[PDB]
A paper describes a structure:
Triosephosphate isomerase (TIM, EC 5.3.1.1) is a key enzyme in glycolysis and catalyzes the reversible isomerization between dihydroxyacetone phosphate (DHAP) and glyceraldehyde 3-phosphate (GAP). The overall structure of OvTIM is similar to that of other known TIMs in that it contains 12 α-helices, three 310-helices, and eight parallel β-sheets, forming a classical α/β barrel fold. In OvTIM, a specific SAD motif (S157–D159) is located between α7 and β6, inducing the formation of a subsequent 310-helix γ2 (D159–I164), although the corresponding region is not conserved in either vertebrate TIMs.
We constructed four variants, including a SAD deletion variant (ΔSAD), variant in which the SAD region was substituted with AAA (AAA), variant in which N115 was replaced with Ala (N115A), and double variant (N115A_ΔSAD). First, the thermal shift of the melting curve of the AAA variant was negligible, indicating that the side chains of the SAD motif that protrude into the solvent region do not contribute to protein stability. In the ΔSAD variant, the corresponding region (K153–W158) was not defined except for the molecule of the region which is stabilized via an interaction with other symmetry molecules, while the AAA variant showed a similar structure as the wild-type. The side chain of the SAD motif protruded into the solvent region and no significant Tm change was observed in the AAA variant, indicating that local structural alterations and the stability of OvTIM are related to the number of amino acids of the SAD motif and not the exact sequence of the SAD motif. In contrast to the sequence-independent contribution of the SAD motif to the surface structure change and stability, the side chains of the SAD motif, which are exposed to the solvent region, are still open to participate in the host-parasite interaction.
Author numbering:
A (entry chain B), B (entry chain A): 5 to 252
Amino acid sequence: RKFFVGGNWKMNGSKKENDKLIEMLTHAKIDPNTEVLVAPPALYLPSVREKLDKRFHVAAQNCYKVPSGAFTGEVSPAMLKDVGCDWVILGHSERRHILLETDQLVGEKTNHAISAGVNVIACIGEKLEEREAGKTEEVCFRQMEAIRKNLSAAAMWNHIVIAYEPVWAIGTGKTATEQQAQEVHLAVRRWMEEKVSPAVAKSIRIIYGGSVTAANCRTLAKQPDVDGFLVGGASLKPDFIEICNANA
Amino acid sequence: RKFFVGGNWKMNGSKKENDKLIEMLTHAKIDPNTEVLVAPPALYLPSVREKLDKRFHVAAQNCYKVPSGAFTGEVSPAMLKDVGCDWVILGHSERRHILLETDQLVGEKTNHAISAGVNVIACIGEKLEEREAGKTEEVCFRQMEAIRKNLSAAAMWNHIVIAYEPVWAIGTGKTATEQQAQEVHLAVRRWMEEKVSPAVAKSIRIIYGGSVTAANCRTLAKQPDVDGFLVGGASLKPDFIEICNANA
């Protein structure tokens, strides 16, 4: 499986700061076997894509589930393709838990994006009260099942990267270990093996979307079922390059 | 009060179709006393603003309530200003009722946008069961109060245009007359007079956001408390020009 590192800029960006990050990526020495993605705010998607080498993927941080219509404030996969972008992050914990997106909506969006030629980082993960009730797997599997049920063709799994987010470690004073990450990633892969196929399970990338830093990235990357990262705050800093090189 | 016509493109747009609409607007004969605004999808905001003369306002279809942070998929007023856009639509019925935005969230966004130098089209309106139960004023006033309570000073109303959306007439087989529109607009203006000030009530624009067509726009515009329109589907068509000229 090809190592995969995505930088989620979240709601951070400006022409001036974007240019600084683009220059950092342009001059960086990165393992050529690593897939690298950045996700700027939607206003900046066309310009960042124009300015950045195709070696780097440029992803939207959200999209909707039809090509056009009466959905004020939403953008469609067709629009992403129109400005040269073929990736999107869907189901991020901030969109599920702050902006109230349901499991079914995430699955509908994932099917539609892939049908339009946009690859998907599909995010899953459990909250602290769910983890404490022993429902880590029950929650993650329910989120995955909502994606699976909504896909329209078996090949769509070739266009998905799964990101596990330990939401229970965000603003709770709890911290996740690399062993805890590996245990969830392995459980998710075995769900793929049982519910989809062993062939998809062996080839799909499952990336870790908790706190990823220059200090912890190598111990996370060496875990056998952790295939890369969806990076938060460190994607805005020179540390992102060290994280891209965590597998080498 | 200066007549105000906004075109909400909703989730419609592409480089090619945007160029056609921009060429239509650039060469159109429009009443010079009308304020005209267009609101493209967020991906296209920088390009549409660059290509359209400053005579036209260019608005985002949504934004968030702080300048930056961990809000994947959201954009801030500072980003809008960074690409030259100084207007936003907030509280549109599609965002309230499909994407689940609360009264309080709309008020928080409105205050923050104005504090950052972005003017706001603030949308209100009641659904069919609410109107049939006699709650038109109760609902509209509740939505207005959530904005009022969250503003930092009464002077911020000078950066607001109120749009009344008869959501009860959107896709229900019910239709609104110009008399029904005038009745609600008058009730909203009298709320402004009592809860804010007569000076603001007499100067704030209250625009109609129901079905607006080339055929009905002149009869709506002549109502004394209807100050313009927030146009939907007709904003993508040459009919938009006739609607911009409804007051002349």
